[model samples]
Target chain A: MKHSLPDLPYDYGALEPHINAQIMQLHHSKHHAAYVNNLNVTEEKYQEALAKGDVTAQIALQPALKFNGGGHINHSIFWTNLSPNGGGEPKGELLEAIKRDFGSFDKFKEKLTAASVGVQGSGWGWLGFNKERGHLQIAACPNQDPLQGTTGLIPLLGIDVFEHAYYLQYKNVRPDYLKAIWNVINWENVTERYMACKK
Target chain B: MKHSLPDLPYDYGALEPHINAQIMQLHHSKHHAAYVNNLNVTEEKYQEALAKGDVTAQIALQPALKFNGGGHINHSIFWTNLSPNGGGEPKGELLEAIKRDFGSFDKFKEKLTAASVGVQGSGWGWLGFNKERGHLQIAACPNQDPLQGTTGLIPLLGIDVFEHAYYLQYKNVRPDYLKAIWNVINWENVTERYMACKK
Candidate 1:
């Protein structure tokens, strides 16, 4: 199937103060949709070049496919994992594992938020599952790299820290937006993600 | 002053299963110390070149200073921040902020652990304070960059993930050593670091 934009579960304005309504509208529709469209166009060109045996064209198209295709895949999950009505408290096995591994729930929060807010350049903050270690973890990736593509961690909570994600509203003041985004974080969605990834 | 070897706070085997005596001895005595010696030598050459206004020599010195000086600075903090007696919990403002920002402590732990365990190539995982945002954050820097120099985060807890940090004992099984390092983390040192940076 041609790549299609997934529907956001809540209205753009639902996230409110954490992520402004205007920002969400543009981010989801304009930004994410653009990635999807570009990804499809690039893939189509690559297939055509391959069919016609245009080696030079195919070589030239490699960068486009990697950038746009990766962009599309990464943003698809980013929008779903974020919710305007989200944030505040995690329950079930996810919570239990956090305490078991990190000493207490509060300590874990301190560490990961520190990571998410600190990413430099165009990248993402991730809460992911490490199947190899059978543990929950926090990480960040640079550029359009998906969590798994870069680190092999199953992405659960994905935070886009690219300039495109918040530069208009936040500018070089990334710390401001990072501090504020927590208000709308969808813990329930993350909880579902955690459960789904569990072996 | 010439950069000299910084003494280890505890014996090599103090960290036990998380890191071995052999790894600790090599990391501290050989690896970390080598960076310090190399940095001093690099700086000396850089100063000599600057005095003569030798453009080529100055340019050539950049990589060495960055790699060795940054390595010396980063590893110095890394050693003390981890202790065989470490990794219990976080308290005070660090704890409160974690809850306020990340929903709960458990999610935070999962995030940081994942980031540390997931690092590719050679790098460092850090819990730091964002001077710009006045928030705690987690971030990974490739190679020997000091956290503040690279991401502008005041270093709190630093984990060295270079192959030299655990390769002898852990080899490609990096996850086991990552899990074990938790036990020797100097939580008390990190807490003090957080409070001091607040000023």
Candidate 2:
């Protein structure tokens, strides 16, 4: 079965003021859609290679699978990570854990924001859970590599630093986009993700 | 303190008819030069991070170092792997090894060409020497991750599949470019590299 693009939880314009409607429309309808399509196509080719037992072909097919597969995985979580009625602060254990791991929630924000801003190319900065360490961790993955697939972390929240994610609104200045995204962060969703991972 | 670009052994036009002069000039002067510059810049920042023991900054800088450092190493070998008066099969021990490892020279060519043509994005197809295995091997690396750095294989010969290496002449047809590149393969240099690794 082909991987289909997931529908955005809210309207394109739902995260307005913080994330403009134009960026969301293109990001969801075009960028994310492309990843879903390419992933299916890549998987089909990989399956053929596998069936043939062609080791060389299998090795050659790895990059496409990783790139497209990661793009699909990362974006699926990203849409739920933002909401019009989101932001402020986490209310319970999530907030307390954030304080414990990063000194304070503000420090966590600063670190994650810095990672997102410092991304040199098309990539993602994540607030992920290190299941082994049983603590929240921050990481940045280049290109489309998913946090977990690349680093063994359980992704709780991801901030896409790809050009398409913020170029239309933030232009060349990524810091502005990073700053604005905080206002639309779905802390409840992140909290829920953190709870599941901690278990 | 800095990584400087190396001059090509032959003139830009030396490998013409196989790799066009324009592609050689831009790939060497522009693309390779950019990597050299970036590697130096990334290294300086990495030095500071190391001094301060800033683990986060160090982790964040990993991609830049790999991308730029690998570009330098791969391209440096790539220049030596091609020549104005190159082509034809390897002689002596190199020929024997290729036959033993890959069944035949033709099969080796087919596998390496398939590897190069199948690259999903910017990357390299390498004919590397595996010291641990004591044999010749073929590998592909995504982006500019050095085969030796990312994988423990010592590079003997490398064909860069980055668009900048052939786009000006080959347009979008990578297989055509891959086919043409064989005409400039410096088997002697590859043999020398193979011998050095064997010792």
Candidate 3:
């Protein structure tokens, strides 16, 4: 399938007070859009390589495919995971799962934030659903790797630690960005994502 | 081995204008310092794991070793690769090698800049000596991976693209930072490194 940029469900300023309009605008219009564009190109090229049985070309193109494809998927999930009127705490079964897996919401928050901030380079921290374990899990992915594809975890929450995500406002202090992100987290969306994995 | 943070050869603000004082100060004091401290801890723990023959523990510690160790080495080299009175062009044999391998100085600049800007995540762009090929080459490394250990290229000049290196000053405009870095490149040091690799 030819990848295309998904429209931001909210206005650029929708994530105000936490993520500024400029940051959101550039991230969507520039960063995410670039991935979509490149992914489409990569897929077409891969098809050509496969048709010709050019395994070397396929091998060379593999990195671009993963990088661009993962960038598209990760950013697509990321935009939906936040809202103008989001945060506080997840409720329903999602909250119950969080406590069971991580002790408490407070502990879960600390662990995820620490993982995000602890990334040595550009990466993501995620809250994911483990289908085999029948519980919640936390993961950290480097570069643009998607959670499900790499680790078989259904991604519920994705916190991007790429410099482009927060450098415009938060600068070098990633913890500050992580703290603010909680204020705009779309727990409703996260809960839905988590519950979907129960099936 | 207990690794310690290296003192920057020049004052933090010495490379101002091209790269501001704040970026240098935080990069040297906080970012680089953290790596050195963690590397020392990782090495100590790794020694224990080896003594106990805890292969799993050793395997887990491997990432920490590479990251912290590479961070220390990369940052140490990075500090010396820039100078207040740096920039211009290499001279003598170094200039000759660049011309022979890359066509011209301008082409080398373009290739290196393209590689640096094209890194999908936090990484470094390098000019290195290829012992087997007997030529100068360019490479890009993700996260804190050292050039020599991973790719067998004896690093001559390393251009850091980690967010902390430029995000404070350049934000997400990596190309702008790449352009500015050229003005402060220590060709003198790069030449010294190149000559050492040849020997």
Candidate 4:
């Protein structure tokens, strides 16, 4: 089945004050919509190429596959990781794990913020669970590269640093955008994701 | 020695209506220059990471190294692949080889143009020499990925599809830019590059 764009759990303006309605609307309806559309197209062609055993065509299709597929996967999770009533801090096991892995919640925020701020171009900063280590980790991925696909991490939270994600409200000041996004982070959703991956 | 941006062989406007002077100047002076600068910085950090045996740091540096390093390598070759006194068909071995591999020069152009036009986002379309196969091939790479480093193909000619390469002139119509670029292709440079890798 072709991948489809997911609807936002809350209204576009729900996360406002932190993430504006305009950015949310465009990012979802336009940007994420485009990825969903293109991914379906690319995968269809890839199926044909694979059936033919055409190595050259298969290799040529790698970029489109990774780019669109990752865009689809990353944005799906990102939408749920923000909420109008989210933020503050995790409770229970997620909070305890963050303390054990990153020393404290504050340090985890600092490192994740730094990773988000340091992204050179369109990309994402992630808080992911390293299943093998059974610990939380922070990573930055360029472009729409999915944290799990590229780095083998089970992403619990992702912060998109793509210019389109924040440019309208944040301008070139990405650090401010990074800071504002924390206020809307869906810690409850992150905790559930973490708990699910812990096993 | 660090990687450096190479000077364009002709004046910025030399390619004329095919690729605007504004595009050339910004693409070379700003885009290519930024890649060279970032490549140098990434390499310095990579070197330190290697010396310290920091596996995470080394892995973290890979994307920047590939993106900036590919930008440096691809652009350095791309500048020499176009000339004011260019276009028309290749003579001698290059012509013979194109016919033998792709059936005809027209067919080769058609395939290459299709590859260029199909690029999803910031990327390159290349007519590269496959040293292992001893033949010509068409390939596309995304977001500053060097054809050779990523695919093992020896690049003979590259058509950058990065929006910065043509948005100023072609706007969103990348197919038109691909059509126009053939008018300025330096086949002699391509032939020389092909012959160099033949041995």
Candidate 5:
């Protein structure tokens, strides 16, 4: 089944001035729209090549398919994890889980933020639930790696720290973007995801 | 030596929409500042451990020092690679070199973007000049890898494709951020760096 872009929980300008409207428009409509569109194209092509046993075509298209397809998959989870009215603290089971895994919520924040800021370029920082390990872990992905694909851990809270997210406002300053994103994080949505993915 | 947050070339909000002000403020003050501060601490600790011949302490801190120190160094280069008045097609020797190396500027961009977007987690996609090889190449580094240390490639134009760069505005969308960053290409800065590194 084909995936589609999830609509924003709030208006395009809802998160401003933390996030701007123009970047949101282009980011969602133009940038994200392209991923969905291109993912369809790449997947369709991959399917055809697979049927024909065209390994070269499949291999050659690997980058595009993964780039666009992974983009589509990762972004779908990312949008859902955010809400306009977000940024409280994690509570209930999730908070206890965080403390259990990382010693404390503060430590979890430190490790996640370190991974996020320490990212060299164009990647993600994930707080995921590793079902096999039965523990919570903080992991970083370089680019558009689906959390489970790269790591067996299912994604919980996904953070995209790429330049396009904040470049329009922060220029080359990425940590600024990282810090502000906390405000819009939907802990409730993430809690549901963690619970469901555990099964 | 300890690294300090470089004063932004422009105001924190100068890149607005592209980056929000609050993100920029915290990114610099808290996030990058922490990297600088921690790197210094690691470096000093490393020296003391070395002097005292504490191998375990030295080895233990290696990851943090490298990750944080590498982050500070890489981001320092990244800021200069972007400018408020930047963004336009590359030109001069850089253009010729790109054409020679990657067939054309557009193709090079496609290759770079493909690599950048395909990164699995917190990492960078780089179009760097390999001084030893005397040619240009695309390389991806996981987490906070300094291009030189990781691949021996001299960074030309560093792309910070981390989610923090675009997550707030773009959500999980990265290609939009990748395509948009070209708009702020400080080619002049890149060209000078390339020339200096090449020689």
Candidate 6:
């Protein structure tokens, strides 16, 4: 089956003040749409190359496949991870996991924020479930690399640190964007993702 | 003692209608300056680490050193590679070398443009003179990796593919920026760089 772009659950303006309408519109229509189209194109080319047994061609295609494929996957989850009304903190079970894994919810925020801010280029900062270790974890993926693909972690929350993500509003100060995102974070959705990984 | 942002060879507005004044200003004053500042700070930390022989600290410091140091080296060359009066084609021995190695000037542009556009994330597309091969070669680097440091190619021309390089004006259309950049090529400086590499 061909890959496709997922519809964002909320309106472009839904996560306003924090992310702004302009960024949301471009992120969905322009950036994410490009990834979906590119991913489909890359995959179709891969199928043909595989059929021909062109190993060199297949090897050359891996970068596009990983970049676009991971772009589609990461952005799809990113949209769901933020909600207009979502913010504050995790409650109950997920909260317990956050505390147990990273010491406390506040500390978890600091760690994830650091990972997000410390990224040198276009990338994602993730809060994920480490199935191998049976704990929550924080990780960063460079330039469209998906968390699970690169780290083997089940993603719960993904914060996009790409310039397109916030450069429109925040300019060079990424931490400002990170600070505001906390207000609109879909902790409810994050908890759902975390719980799904538990089973 | 410390890395510094080199003054742009021309006024920021000089590259206008192609690169735009705002981008040149910020690229020189903000993006490139940040690299200089961070590189200096990283070196100081390295100094302290080496004094105590902290292997862990030294190893961890390598990434910062390379990223920021490469940023400094790359941008230093990039600024001198473009000019308001630059464009058309190389003249003299440089012209002969271009034809000898890449077939022709137009073909070389096409090759370099292909390399520049092919970069997945923040990076530079470079044309360098290879001492080993005694020919002009094209390369692309991810993030701020310096061409000489990464590939041992003496960089003659470097194109900043970082979004901040063109995002404000070009937005998602990088090729538009690439097309315009050729009109401001600074072949004189490129030839000077190319000649310097020869014995």
The candidates' DockQ values read: 0.01, 0.03, 0.02, 0.03, 0.01, 0.02
Show model 6 residue runs off by greater than 4 Å: B1-199
Q: Scored by Cα lDDT, where does model 2 land?
A: 0.84
B15-108, model 2: which lDDT tens digit per residue?
Answer: 9888989899899999899988887786677556445633334444556666777788889999999998898899999999999999999999
TM-score of each: 0.50, 0.55, 0.53, 0.56, 0.50, 0.53
Model 3 lDDT at residue A194: 78
Residue-level lDDT of model 3, residues A1-199, one tens digit each, is 4557898889999888789999999999999999888877866775564355333343345456667777887899999999998989888899988888899999999999999999999888988988998888899988987777677788999999999999999999989999999999999898888778885
Q: In model 1, where do residues sit more than 4 Å from their true spots?
A: A1-199
Error of 5 at A87 (Å): 0.3
For candidate 5, write residues A74-154 as lDDT tens digits. Answer: 777777777787787798889999988899987888799899988897988999998888889889987775666556677
Give the clash total for candidate 5. 42
Worst 10 residues of 5 chain A by lDDT: A53-62
Worst 10 residues of 3 chain B by lDDT: B50-59
Report the CAPRI category for model 6. Answer: incorrect
> Candidate 3 docking category?
incorrect
Model 4, A40-128: lDDT tens per residue? 78666755643453334434555776677788888999998999989798999999988998899999999999999999978899999
Error of 2 at A39 (Å): 0.1
lDDT of 5 by residue, B38-154 (tens): 876776775564456333344445467657766786777777887777887688788888999999999999999999998899887887898877888888888877777656687
| Candidate 2 pairs with clashing backbones | none
CAPRI quality level assigned to candidate 4 from its DockQ score: incorrect
Model 1 chain A is weakest, by summed lDDT over 10 consecutive residues, at A53-62
A189: Cα error in model 1, Å: 66
Best by TM-score: 4
Candidate 2 chain A: worst-modelled 10 consecutive residues by lDDT: A50-59
